[PDB]
Amino acid sequence: KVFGRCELAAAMKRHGLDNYRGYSLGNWVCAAKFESNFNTQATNRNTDGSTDYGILQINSRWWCNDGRTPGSRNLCNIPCSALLSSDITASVNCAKKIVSDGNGMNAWVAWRNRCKGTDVQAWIRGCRL
């Protein structure tokens, strides 16, 4: 599913990400913009052979099982395919686990490099939340 910016903001809020671990909703929407272009079905292979899945490009190296990432974990206890659903529950719940792991949203390099320290509230500008 390709979410609209404001639609995704509202869903994310409904799923309790606004200000989760201190990160306002714009941070989350910004991250999703640059990780996946708001597409739930986005996937990307990394150089180590792990794969990133879904609107926040969560990696099979630590967080989900895809059966083809040797020596990986599955900390959100989910199949990676669950991160591709039009329903963002698995992605949100797994992201809450990631962002709570110690390094906050710096876990997402696209967030660090393109959202961190910017005016992220622009990403929710105009939205009925």
> CA–CA separation, 20 vs 37, rounded Å?
21
Which residue ranges make up each domain of the chain? 1-129
> CA–CA separation, 50 vs 125, rounded Å?
35
Distances (CA, A) of 26 to 14, 29, 42, 123: 14, 5, 20, 5
Contacts of residue 61, defined as CB under 8 A and 6 or more positions apart, other chains included, come to 46, 48, 50, 69, 72, 73
Q: Which of 7, 18, 35, 87 is catalytic?
A: 35
Residue with tokens 């961190």: 116
What 3-state DSSP class applies to 58?
A: strand
Its CATH class, for the domain covering 1-129, is: mainly alpha
Which of 31, 40, 26, 38 minimizes the C-alpha distance to 82? 40
Give me the residues paired with residue 35 across strands: none
Distances (CA, A) of 57 to 21, 52, 100, 122: 19, 4, 16, 22
Q: Based on DSSP, count helices (H) and strands (E) in the chain, helices before strands.
A: 4, 3
DSSP letter at 23?
Answer: B
Q: Is 7 a catalytic site residue?
A: no
Experimental method of this PDB entry: X-ray
DSSP secondary structure string for all residues of 70-101: TT---TT-SBGGGGGSSS-HHHHHHHHHHHTS
Burial annotation 88-127 (CB, 10 A radius, 16+ → b, else e) = bebbbebbbebbeeeebbebbebbeeebbeeebeebbeeb
19 token code pair = 């200000």
1 CB neighbour count, 10 Å cutoff = 14
Using left for φ > 0, alpha for ψ between -120 and 50, and beta otherwise, residue 16 falls in left
Q: Which of 18, 52, 66, 87 is catalytic?
A: 52
Query: Is 101 annotated to bind ligand?
Result: yes
Contacts of residue 80, defined as CB under 8 A and 6 or more positions apart, other chains included, come to 51, 53, 58, 60, 64, 65, 66
